[PDB]
Amino acid sequence: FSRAAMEMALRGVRKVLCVAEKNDAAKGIADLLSNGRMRRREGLSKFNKIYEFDYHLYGQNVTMVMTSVSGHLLAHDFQMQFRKWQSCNPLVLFEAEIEKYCPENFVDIKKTLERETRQCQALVIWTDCDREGENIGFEIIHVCKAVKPNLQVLRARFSEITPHAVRTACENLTEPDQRVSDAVDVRQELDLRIGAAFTRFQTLRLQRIFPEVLAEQLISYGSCQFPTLGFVVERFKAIQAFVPEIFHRIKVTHDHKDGIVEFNWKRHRLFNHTACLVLYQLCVEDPMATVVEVRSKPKSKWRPQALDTVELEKLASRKLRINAKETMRIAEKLYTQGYISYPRTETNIFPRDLNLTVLVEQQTPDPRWGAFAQSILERGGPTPRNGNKSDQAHPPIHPTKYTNNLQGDEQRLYEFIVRHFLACCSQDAQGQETTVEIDIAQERFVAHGLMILARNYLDVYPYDHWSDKILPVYEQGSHFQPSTVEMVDGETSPPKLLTEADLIALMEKHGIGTDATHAEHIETIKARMYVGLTPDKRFLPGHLGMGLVEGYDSMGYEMSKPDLRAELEADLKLICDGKKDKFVVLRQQVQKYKQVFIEAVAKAKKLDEALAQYFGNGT
Amino acid sequence: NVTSIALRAETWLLAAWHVKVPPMWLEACINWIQEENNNVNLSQAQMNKQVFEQWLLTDLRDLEHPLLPDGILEIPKGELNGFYALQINSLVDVSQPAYSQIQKLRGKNTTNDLVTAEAQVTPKPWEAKPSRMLMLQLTDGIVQIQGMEYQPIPILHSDLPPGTKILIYGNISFRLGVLLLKPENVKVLGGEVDALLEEYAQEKVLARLIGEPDL
Numbered sequence A: 001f002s003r004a005a006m007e008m009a010l011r012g013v014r015k016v017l018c019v020a021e022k023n024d025a026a027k028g029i030a031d032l033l034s035n036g037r038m039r040r041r042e043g044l045s046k047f048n049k050i051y052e053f054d055y056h057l058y059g060q061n062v063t064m065v066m067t068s069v070s071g072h073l074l075a076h077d078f079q080m081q082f083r084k085w086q087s088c089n090p091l092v093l094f095e096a097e098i099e100k101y102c103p104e105n106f107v108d109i110k111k112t113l114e115r116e117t118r119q120c121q122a123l124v125i126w127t128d129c130d131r132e133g134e135n136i137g138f139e140i141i142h143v144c145k146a147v148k149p150n151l152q153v154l155r156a157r158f159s160e161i162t163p164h165a166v167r168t169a170c171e172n173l174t175e176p177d178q179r180v181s182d183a184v185d186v187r188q189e190l191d192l193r194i195g196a197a198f199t200r201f202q203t204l205r206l207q208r209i210f211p212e213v214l215a216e217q218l219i220s221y222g223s224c225q226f227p228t229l230g231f232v233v234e235r236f237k238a239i240q241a242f243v244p245e246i247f248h249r250i251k252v253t254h255d256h257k258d259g260i261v262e263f264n265w266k267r268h269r270l271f272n273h274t275a276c277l278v279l280y281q282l283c284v285e286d287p288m289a290t291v292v293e294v295r296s297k298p299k300s301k302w303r304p305q306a307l308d309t310v311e312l313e314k315l316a317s318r319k320l321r322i323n324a325k326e327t328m329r330i331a332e333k334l335y336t337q338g339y340i341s342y343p344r345t346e347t348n349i350f351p352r353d354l355n356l357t358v359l360v361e362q363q364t365p366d367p368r369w370g371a372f373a374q375s376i377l378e379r380g381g382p383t384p385r386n387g388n389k390s391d392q393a394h395p396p397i398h399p400t401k402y403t404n405n406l407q408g409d410e411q412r413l414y415e416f417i418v419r420h421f422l423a424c425c426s427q428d429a430q431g432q433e434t435t436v437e438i439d440i441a442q443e444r445f446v447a448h449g450l451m452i453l454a455r456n457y458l459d460v461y462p463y464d465h466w467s468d469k470i471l472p473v474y475e476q477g478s479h480f481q482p483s484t485v486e487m488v489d490g491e492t493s494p495p496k497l498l499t500e501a502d503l504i505a506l507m508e509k510h511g512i513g514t515d516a517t518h519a520e521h522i523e524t525i526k527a528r529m530y531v532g533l534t535p536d537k538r539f540l541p542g543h544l545g546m547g548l549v550e551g552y553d554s555m556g557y558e559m560s561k562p563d564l565r566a567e568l569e570a571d572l573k574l575i576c577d578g579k580k581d582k583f584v585v586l587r588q589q590v591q592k593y594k595q596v597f598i599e600a601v602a603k604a605k606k607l608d609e610a611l612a613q614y615f616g617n618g619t
Numbered sequence B: 001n002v003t004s005i006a007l008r009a010e011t012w013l014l015a016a017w018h019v020k021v022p023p024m025w026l027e028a029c030i031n032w033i034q035e036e037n038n039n040v041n042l043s044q045a046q047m048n049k050q051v052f053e054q055w056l057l058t059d060l061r062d063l064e065h066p067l068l069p070d071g072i073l074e075i076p077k078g079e080l081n082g083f084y085a086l087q088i089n090s091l092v093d094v095s096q097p098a099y100s101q102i103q104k105l106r107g108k109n110t111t112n113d114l115v116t117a118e119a120q121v122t123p124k125p126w127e128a129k130p131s132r133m134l135m136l137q138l139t140d141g142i143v144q145i146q147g148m149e150y151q152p153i154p155i156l157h158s159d160l161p162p163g164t165k166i167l168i169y170g171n172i173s174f175r176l177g178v179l180l181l182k183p184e185n186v187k188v189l190g191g192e193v194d195a196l197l198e199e200y201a202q203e204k205v206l207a208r209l210i211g212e213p214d215l
């Protein structure tokens, strides 16, 4: 814990084995700590290199042996006996013994870690600082502790790959968190058991019932992919059920030199022809408009709130037309290359420790946003718009280094992250709102006006729009003849099919897909052909996707609802905080899902009946 | 012979509530109230109350006693003056879509149906509202006209039972068989009609406006 305790622990350490999540992170972290002085060496894996370099750890000169893994080193599965589909009843998979093993393609990495452990006295985990990263860290620990059981294990915590961050990580090494690793082991186990039991049950059943339609096809089940599909089917059904209605409104317009002024009815609209016809007839006879109230007040448009993973995933889809899976891929590439902070965070509050003034200064060399960044500094400095969430691990996603060398979508997302950051650190747009109320035969109509005085954050954030709506001068008490007095018709519009940002919003609202896993589950229902994208590009459910959701929902228990997964994901967060143990969560979640399974097997014919609506007869 | 009590009740009904009733119904009604309270000799005050309570529960369509002036539907526009104790057969809000209304009434949750990623475009207080407009189907039992909430009348609400008796008074401008009612022109007397509760229940009224079958 203390500096004296650490220095004492480090005594007699000559070689320190360091392990990163991927080779590019290993090459990157080693290059920064060594100042490019690192010496490359070969591992037993051709894609996972060793970078030796001299470094000073807690007052001890050591040789840092920096290598990497390639994501998860260990695979989880049932024993060989339960692995074959025709070897057991899917119900036994809720209790069937599960084992962790190293795949053939990763054995070279496992053997490199083991090899280096022999020459090293300490182990430092440099995997990304998220739940999966801590679990990968514990996979590396288990492999090395098999060689040296008394090996000193430390954990480097960092939110960016920059010289200051990686140097501070070395001065503040901590203990690896078993709690967050355990939550990953619990989720991995539940996903395998619920996944396997329900997949084997429905795939085998539906392949026997509909052989011509679902031959050799995999009808997979996921505890999270199912309520995700549920949102898409729920919205489609909402549109299907929606009844549009004709409404009527009195439209009064008044012509001016360079623009027509439209006064909007204070009664807004009526769903009755005779009700509106009567009020309109009153308006044609004596249409003399009198200015009742000419009111004006200051109006403001708020600058964006500090950026988190969800807002990035949604805004990149809406504003840049990059899908969440690609956004997270590019965002991870920019993070690894040192241009942005860790893009997997729930934080929308800038920590007090973080120097925003430097981050803004750093962006002043840019031709496009440079002048604006300078403008923040000239106006006193950065004034961020913070939210209410903090994971207490990472800061909001922000630019950590300036680069002009990016291309394609990589440039587009970096530019977005920079502009959002500067907009957030800027001021709100300030305008003047004006309103003119007119009376025509005791009927009140209102025209609105806007005059933006200071655009502020809008000058760097083109993704948001604010436009002047300048109204002519109307004196309180004036009388005038309107250009036209009409009785126009309208109709109510149904909802639209969900976009990816719309689907992420629903997932967020209901607490599923937490820990930035939204994209993974949206991608699974896309890939399994349960949903399809329209040209618009919105989610349309397929016949199999549709049939499964209305099949399980007809069984009584509302299975398409995200309530059970949200409870599961909630329990996982408790394991991380040490607020709940892994054994109670496992026993409770397994009992809950085994019950839902047993009820579904009992009413299995409901699945056949729901899909028969699309594929016809079948036995 | 209850004709002496009938004149006294007729005087009171008109004086206190502007209720006009046919002599035959009134006499038949008094006789029934006398049979119901056989054990006692009721006062005129108690008789007047019980007669009025029976009136509130009576279907004006079955009363055959015209109240509203002749050809009120024949005149395109005009003004109506005087006191009328009419009956609401059905009632609906025309400021809100019937589909939106039936959904809320049916208690089904449509939260996820209005979820979008697009930023909250804060509406104006008459778009965030707008003020309610009830369209009443009023009758004297012979002629059927419409009553519009021209100005907010808070005593009226969509949940008023079909057959509810209401006093329509003062100067009221009317157009195309629609009365432009202001709060100062309406008074709710109460009551209900069993025969109407069935057919013109708010669920059934709205279901008809969205084309639901078997109605």
Ligand SMILES: [Ca+2]
Pocket (backbone or CB within 6 Å): A021, A128, A132, A133
């Ligand atoms: Ca990762």
